[PDB]
Design a protein around this ligand. Structure first.
Ligand SMILES: Cc1cc2nc3c(=O)[nH]c(=O)nc-3n(C[C@H](O)[C@H](O)[C@H](O)COP(=O)(O)OP(=O)(O)OC[C@H]3O[C@@H](n4cnc5c(N)ncnc54)[C@H](O)[C@@H]3O)c2cc1C
Length: 453
């Protein structure tokens, strides 16, 4: 129980009622530092711990693919917390109003939530803080090393954040203590009812094709805390050995496929790191996978935390803002609208195959994601339009969308964030360029195109 994982958002008078855990980003019962610290505070106060989840009005800004994945996991989570005598309350509406009412109605003594550097999460905290008088804590249950402890500033490169994160690994990379159940069961609708209503409201915006059939294939990633563990065990036993040599081959499914579970917090990355470190395989493949789940994943939280405008052109490096500004008036070879990018109606078959995989599976390959967003910059009227188009298609169709990884991954491709300057080209400027011929020399582009017609 390292006290550096928990930060105080607002001090106040601790009430004589239960400790309330505000689950937002880490929807899981095991390996949850936020839930564990809530159980410790509750035990020292001689009071049980409760879990609350808010079903916000922003769910309609996404699709059914993300609403069903996250609600089906909550149905499994409600069972697991029930086995620990931990009641879970699911509220619908504004967190600033539903939590401020839950705290006063249930006589909350302490409020705890998990950490998320997103702007929407900071909006809820501001509304909640002004409506409560009890202590307010937050816990970094998503990163191995707390985001405010790994670095005190924004790291402009990976080679500057890697020594800082690895130097703190011997302290924060530890095993998880068991979640002690509540002593006695203590003293707002069914999740299946909220799922049917939410789907009926989202159906008119469902992604379809010509024959009115749905585009999403939900049999690729089963949601839940139990399904995340099976995926982790399959990757370590079957795909971890070849990850280093095939992570850039979209025609091979050699990736861990853990991101949708990682985004919703259905599995803890620290648990994944612990299992991989004890696994004996290719050292080059292990070093490559850890550089993705530790360095690049937690540097995305670092990027969103220390850059308020992480989704804007202002967060780009000075060399990239000046390079893009010098090529703003360059005549673009193509200009596609958001509807053409969404439907995959560009002249690039490789790009359309990446967009069709996104629409069909909700998880586009990591390598094509770099090509997918860089061509949005090349075929847009301005870098700002490319950012908004890339963010829209990402957050809407990616199962791991609306994530700090997504915003840091798009800032890297369009604005060179966490990258360096390359040869100066037109339109794109000094941003790293990925050509269609370059992808042909890296993998079989024909097999990837034919797989997603
Ligand atoms: C344009 C673009 C958009 C992106 N949008 C998303 C997004 O919406 N959501 C999202 O979680 N990630 C996004 N990524 C990061 C990355 O593409 C995915 O995390 C990765 O492809 C997820 O599939 P995986 O779990 O099988 O990858 P793996 O190769 O098995 O890696 C495991 C984990 O390492 C992390 N990771 C790997 N690569 C990156 C990376 N480049 N940046 C940050 N973390 C990484 C991820 O958490 C990932 O789950 C984006 C990257 C780009 C270039």
């Amino acid at each position: 129980m390292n006290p550096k994982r928990i930060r105080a958002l607002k001090s106040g008078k601790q009430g004589d009622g239960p400790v309330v855990y505000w689950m937002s980003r880490d929807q899981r019962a095991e390996d949850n530092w936020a839930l564990l610290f809530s159980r410790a505070i509750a035990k020292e106060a001689n009071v049980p711990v409760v879990v609350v989840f808010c079903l916000t009005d922003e769910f309609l800004e996404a699709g059914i693919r993300q609403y069903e994945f996250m609600l089906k996991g909550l149905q499994e989570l409600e069972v697991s917390l029930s086995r620990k005598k931990i009641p879970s309350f699911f509220l619908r509406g504004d967190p600033g109003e539903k939590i401020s009412r839950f705290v006063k109605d249930y006589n909350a003594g302490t409020l705890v939530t998990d950490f998320s550097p997103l702007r929407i999460k900071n909006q809820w905290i501001e509304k909640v803080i002004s409506g409560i008088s009890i202590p307010f804590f937050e816990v970094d249950a998503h990163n191995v090393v707390p985001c405010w402890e790994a670095s005190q500033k924004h790291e402009y490169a990976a080679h500057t954040f890697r020594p800082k994160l690895y130097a703190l690994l011997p302290e924060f990379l530890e095993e998880f203590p068991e979640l002690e159940p509540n002593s006695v069961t203590p003293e707002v609708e069914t999740l299946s009812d909220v799922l049917e209503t939410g789907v009926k409201a989202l159906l008119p915006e469902r992604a379809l094709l010509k024959n009115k059939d749905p585009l999403f294939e939900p049999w690729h990633f089963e949601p839940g805390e139990k399904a995340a563990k099976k995926v982790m065990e399959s990757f370590i036993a079957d795909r971890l050995d070849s990850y280093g040599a095939l992570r850039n081959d979209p025609t091979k499914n050699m990736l861990s496929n853990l991101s949708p579970y990682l985004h919703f917090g259905q599995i803890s990355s620290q648990r994944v790191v612990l299992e991989v470190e004890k696994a004996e395989s290719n050292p080059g493949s292990k070093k490559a996978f850890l550089d993705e789940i530790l360095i690049w994943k937690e540097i995305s939280d670092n990027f969103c935390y220390y850059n308020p405008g992480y989704d804007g052109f202002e967060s780009f490096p000075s060399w990239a803002k000046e390079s893009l500004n010098a090529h703003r008036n360059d005549v673009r070879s193509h200009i596609y609208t958001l509807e053409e990018f969404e439907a995959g109606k560009t002249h690039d078959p490789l790009w359309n195959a990446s967009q069709m995989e996104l629409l069909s599976t909700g998880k586009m390959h990591g390598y094509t994601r770099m090509y997918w967003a860089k061509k949005i910059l090349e075929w847009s009227e301005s870098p700002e339009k490319a950012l908004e188009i890339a963010i829209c298609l990402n957050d809407r169709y990616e199962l791991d969308g609306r994530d700090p990884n997504g915003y840091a991954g798009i800032a890297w491709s369009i604005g060179g964030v966490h990258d360096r300057a390359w040869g100066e080209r037109e339109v794109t400027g000094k941003i790293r360029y990925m050509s269609y011929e370059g992808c042909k020399r890296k993998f079989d582009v024909k097999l990837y195109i034919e797989k997603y017609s």
